Write a protein that binds this ligand. Structure first.
Ligand SMILES: NS(=O)(=O)c1ccc(NC(=O)C[C@]23C[C@H]4C[C@H](C[C@H](C4)C2)C3)cc1
Ligand SMILES: [Zn+2]
Length: 257
């Protein structure tokens, strides 16, 4: 099956998932000088005060913090979006070294990691339906650089010992995802895709301009996770990122100048 190794990594994905070579694939490089300021872009509306986290899961590719998305509890609105998008999960992609790990790049610059807060358009009823629509998902992407610790990340870091291997999950209630946001909500936006198989072209990407900082110890703990299941040979979960894909017939818009 697919993964991030030499023999099953991003260069191989197109054989099982031909959409890998499609017209709106993610991630992309964000060329800041070519991005277009769009003065009609609305401020983002992040409403996470009623967020209900449930569980954290190692799925063999990353770890997901899952939320109750059966009511409008944590929602994203505004920006380039019309309608209401419910938070279903967040996860990260990260590197084996501080100089790589993000999926999006900014003027070819790679960050140490990238956080994805995944939301789906409530007009489609459930997540499985939403991924089949060109405006089905909105993913809020946030870059991580190594520097000071991010206090709101620590509870996530603390529980990783409990989900070291593929298929492990742990209860993860009462987590506040607002503690993962930077100060500014200035963003770039473009139409794209899931960045792992099935690579469906269903995502409005909203990538924040301001990275958050996390400590060396925090990212080091990400790198102690395993891609493998318990009792299988140990493969460190690092470099679980897809490289930038061609922009093709797309323009990246900026909410700021
Ligand atoms: N990195 S990213 O934010 O772009 C991202 C987000 C999410 C996924 N995958 C999933 O949620 C799993 C899932 C498996 C099948 C097929 C679809 C729909 C349903 C049933 C859920 C996808 C992959 C990448
Ligand atoms: Zn992701």
């Amino acid at each position: 099956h697919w993964g991030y190794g030499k023999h099953n990594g991003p260069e191989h994905w197109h054989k099982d998932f031909p959409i890998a070579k499609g017209e709106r694939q993610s991630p992309v490089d964000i060329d800041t000088h070519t991005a277009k300021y769009d003065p009609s872009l609305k401020p983002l509306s992040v409403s996470y005060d009623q967020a209900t986290s449930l569980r954290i899961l190692n799925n063999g590719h990353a770890f997901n913090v899952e939320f109750d998305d059966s009511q409008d509890k944590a929602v994203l609105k505004g920006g380039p979006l019309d309608g209401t998008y419910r938070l279903i999960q967040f996860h990260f992609h990260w590197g084996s070294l501080d100089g790589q790990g993000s999926e999006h790049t900014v003027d070819k610059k790679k960050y140490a990691a990238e956080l994805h807060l995944v939301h789906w358009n409530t007009k489609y009823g459930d997540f499985g339906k939403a991924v089949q629509q060109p405006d089905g998902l909105a993913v809020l992407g946030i870059f991580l650089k190594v520097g000071s610790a991010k206090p709101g990340l620590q509870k996530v870091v603390d529980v990783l010992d409990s989900i070291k291997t593929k298929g492990k999950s742990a209860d993860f209630t009462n987590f506040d995802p607002r503690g993962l946001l930077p100060e500014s909500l200035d963003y770039w936006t473009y139409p794209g895709s899931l960045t792992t198989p099935p690579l469906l072209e269903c995502v409005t990407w909203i990538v924040l301009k301001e990275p958050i900082s996390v400590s060396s110890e925090q990212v080091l703990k990400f790198r102690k996770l395993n891609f493998n299941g318990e009792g299988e040979p140990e493969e460190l979960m690092v470099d679980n990122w897809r490289p930038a894909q061609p922009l093709k017939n797309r323009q990246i818009k900026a909410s700021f100048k």
